[PDB]
Design a protein around this ligand. Structure first.
Ligand SMILES: O=C(c1c(F)cccc1F)N1CCCC1
Length: 171
């Protein structure tokens, strides 16, 4: 049984208890914290690609009203985000299991852009998700895993200064 764990869940939970926010820019902004995943139970000799996408956790637009995030009343369906390929992909199971898989180079944007960057909708709430894709072998296989601890709202600037302070304290 293939096992997926969040590295530094301690710290993600402090962000989650405040409602986490991630900046999006036209050119794209790297994440803090960085999603880092512990993986065991891969075939060390099998080939795999690690993919990252962002599920829209609800269908609403959120707004920071009198020190509190509150959802809009007008849900619209949210099309899936594009997928980010971990740049170590494709690689042997041994490679992925020798250290936490760190998505340090993904950039979050608000604008449809050349390559790499993932476009999110500002003021929507997102739940990061990975796919582990067994490649090159005969039988293709996908294992997916969500990380509720890593939920955030996409923002063009921070609203809750408690988030601002935590971001700086721990970076
Ligand atoms: O063949 C690829 C791929 C890659 F793994 C790295 C660069 C470009 C690619 F199309 N993948 C299999 C499904 C998910 C990623």
């Amino acid at each position: 049984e293939l096992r997926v764990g969040l590295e530094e869940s301690e710290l993600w939970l402090r962000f989650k208890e405040l409602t986490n926010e991630m900046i999006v820019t036209k050119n794209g902004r790297r994440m803090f914290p960085v999603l880092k995943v512990n993986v065991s139970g891969l075939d060390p000799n099998a080939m795999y690609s690690f993919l990252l996408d962002f599920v829209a956790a609800d269908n609403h637009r959120w707004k920071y009203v009198n020190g509190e995030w509150v959802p809009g009343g007008k849900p619209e369906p949210q099309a899936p985000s594009c997928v980010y390929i971990h740049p170590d992909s494709p690689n042997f199971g041994a490679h992925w299991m020798k250290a936490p898989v760190s998505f340090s180079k993904v950039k979050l944007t608000n604008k449809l852009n050349g390559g790499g960057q993932i476009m999110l909708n500002s003021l929507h709430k997102y739940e990061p998700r990975i796919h582990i894709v067994r490649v090159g072998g005969p039988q293709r296989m996908i294992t997916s895993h969500c990380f509720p601890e890593t939920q955030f709202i996409a923002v063009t600037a921070y609203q809750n200064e408690e988030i601002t302070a935590l971001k700086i304290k721990y970076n």
